[PDB]
């Protein structure tokens, strides 16, 4: 029965119940249903008008908190002598909820999510005075042509949604829409992306938002700067389906749900909850 | 009253006399794809009796040292009967499932089965960064044994696995769990040979224990597809 629930439910008073046939404490877990034993039906209650709002447990309010999804300190200098592995004043980033575990465990509570990403790009700068650098954050789709240089002609943004912003400005906030080809983001994808057997397991590219190619629009300055670009994603307009067990073991990788666990309890493989002495030993005991 | 249950699908039928109930998963009964949700434009073949019936999988020996068993759907059924031939000949499928897991023992045995149907069970390998390959996931009709079912082989918790559609086979109380699964995918239809929506998971939370003569107690699984559609006809692949 679907009903609008704004506050937690009231408790009716109850009296002495001595009745054959009606055993409300006795329930069947084997049916899979959670026990419907009301607190009135189990113990003797008073009338309580419960005014506690349930609004902070809304899945919209649960997940619409702008959490960190990307962070790169990258050097901002002459890159004529640097190696061809570091960021030559730009970084591509396939937009990925899996990189940071606080938002990842929250989004992996559910199986399917339908949200709009409210990407806030916080750029901060340190010296190896601070410059007022202008940054471009060109939104490239999944697999499309990502730039090769800082001053390459992919940054002209004929159709890719670039956002130009400065360090001295407030952080650039754009709204990435619901960009899955399916009706929800498959947070877990039990299956393979490709038709051949070489495809990566669990990684649905429909779950992938796209690339976030971020460069610094200014040319290279005679001193080098370490520019750290933090990206904050706020899921919004959130519809969520099929909740899951929250992940207890520590994450190993962003590409999959591999597990190793801690060496000892808590959150270990053989023992998730921290150990105690016996089953009849109370750890936090009020001894006076 | 709810202990007896006959499930008539197609030419198949299953009675059970110690049943708990049957779990219509997330309060949702399977149906065909409606026109407002439909995507593939061609007329889907709906055989309605050649596939909508109980395909009984191979039984697995419920023992003392057993960790668990898992069957990924429809990967368990992509080579069985007319569901398998419709899978191999079509690009798309949309089918709910009616899993009926059979496991009985005497009134002297003890044990508990977490018969839980996990949607989108992205497994994880243990103590490595390499993703599980094709052979580690797509076991087929045989199914797979859990390696660490206490964490459900994906770092999550078995303790919270009752958030999924589940029933219990407590050998004290009942001997058959029945979970009626709808179409659980973000897409309306999907390619069956490279994706599995539901994963039936069967876990020994309480192991098989008795003091009598140790008869073989197996766990038989009878998965019936429900409300099958199939679009995109072509040659078979297998």
């Amino acid at each position: 029965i679907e009903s609008i629930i704004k506050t937690a439910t009231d408790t009716v008073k109850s009296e002495i119940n001595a009745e054959l046939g009606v055993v409300p404490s006795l329930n069947a877990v084997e049916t899979g249903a959670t026990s419907n034993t009301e607190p009135e039906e189990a113990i003797q209650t008073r009338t309580v008008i419960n005014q506690h709002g349930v609004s902070e447990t809304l899945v919209e309010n649960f997940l619409s908190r702008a959490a960190l999804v990307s962070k790169r300190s990258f050097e901002y200098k002459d890159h004529t002598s640097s190696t061809a592995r570091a960021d030559k004043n730009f970084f591509k980033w396939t937009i990925n909820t899996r990189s940071f575990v606080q938002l990842r465990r929250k989004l992996e509570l559910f199986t399917y999510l339908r949200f709009d990403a409210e990407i806030t790009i916080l750029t901060t700068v340190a010296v190896n005075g601070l410059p007022d650098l202008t940054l471009q954050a060109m939104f490239v789709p999944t697999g499309a042509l990502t730039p090769e240089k800082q001053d390459s002609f992919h940054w002209q943004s004929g159709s890719n949604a670039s956002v130009f912003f400065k360090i001295s400005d407030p952080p650039a906030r754009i709204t990435i829409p619901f960009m899955c080809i399916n009706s929800a983001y498959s947070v877990f994808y039990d299956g393979f992306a490709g038709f051949e057997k070489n495809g990566l397991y669990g990684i649905n590219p429909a779950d992938t938002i796209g690339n976030l190619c971020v460069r610094i629009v200014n040319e290279h300055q005679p001193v080098g700067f370490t520019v750290t670009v933090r990206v904050y994603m706020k899921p919004k307009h959130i519809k969520a389906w099929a909740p899951r067990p929250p992940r207890t073991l520590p994450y190993m990788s962003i590409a999959n749900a591999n597990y190793k666990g801690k060496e000892r309890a808590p959150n270990a493989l053989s023992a998730i909850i921290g150990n105690r002495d016996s089953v009849k030993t109370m750890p936090h005991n009020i001894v006076n | 009253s709810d202990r007896v249950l006959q499930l008539k699908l197609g030419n198949s039928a299953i009675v059970t006399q110690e049943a708990a109930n049957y779990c219509c998963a997330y309060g949702e009964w399977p149906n065909y794809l409606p026109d407002h949700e439909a995507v593939a434009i061609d007329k889907p073949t709906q055989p309605e009796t050649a596939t909508d019936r109980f395909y009984t999988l191979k039984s697995v020996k419920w023992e003392t040292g057993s960790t668990g068993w898992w069957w990924k759907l429809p990967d368990a059924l992509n080579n069985i009967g007319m569901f398998g031939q419709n899978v191999q000949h079509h690009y798309l499928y949309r089918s709910g499932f009616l899993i009926h897991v059979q496991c009985n023992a005497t009134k002297f045995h003890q044990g508990a089965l977490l018969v839980v149907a996990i949607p989108e069970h992205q497994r994880g390998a243990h103590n490595t960064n390499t993703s599980p390959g094709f052979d580690d996931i797509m076991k087929g009709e045989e199914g797979g044994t859990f390696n660490h079912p206490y964490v459900l082989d994906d770092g999550t918790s078995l303790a919270c696995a009752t958030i999924f559609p589940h029933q219990w086979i407590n050998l004290r109380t009942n001997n058959s769990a029945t979970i009626v699964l709808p179409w659980m995918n973000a897409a309306p239809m999907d390619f069956p040979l490279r994706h599995n929506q539901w994963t039936l998971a069967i876990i020994p939370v309480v192991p098989l224990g008795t003091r009598t003569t140790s008869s073989m107690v197996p766990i038989t699984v009878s998965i019936a597809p429900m409300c099958c559609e199939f679009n995109g006809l072509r040659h078979a692949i297998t």
Binding site: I1, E2, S3, I4, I5, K6, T31, G32, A33, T34, N36, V54, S55, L58, E60, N61, S64, D116, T175, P177, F178, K234, K236, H237, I238 | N21, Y22, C23, C24, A25, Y26, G27, E28, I163, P165, V180
Partner: peptide, 30 residues
């Protein structure tokens, strides 16, 4: 609340959907 954009996804978060149905989880049986 404000939403001076031309796209309905660009609005603020819809923190008003108080409709809940726990009986598809706590009582998923038929």
């Amino acid at each position: 609340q404000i939403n001076f954009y031309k796209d309905s996804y660009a609005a603020s978060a819809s923190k008003q959907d108080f409709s809940q149905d726990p009986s598809k989880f706590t009582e998923p049986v038929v």
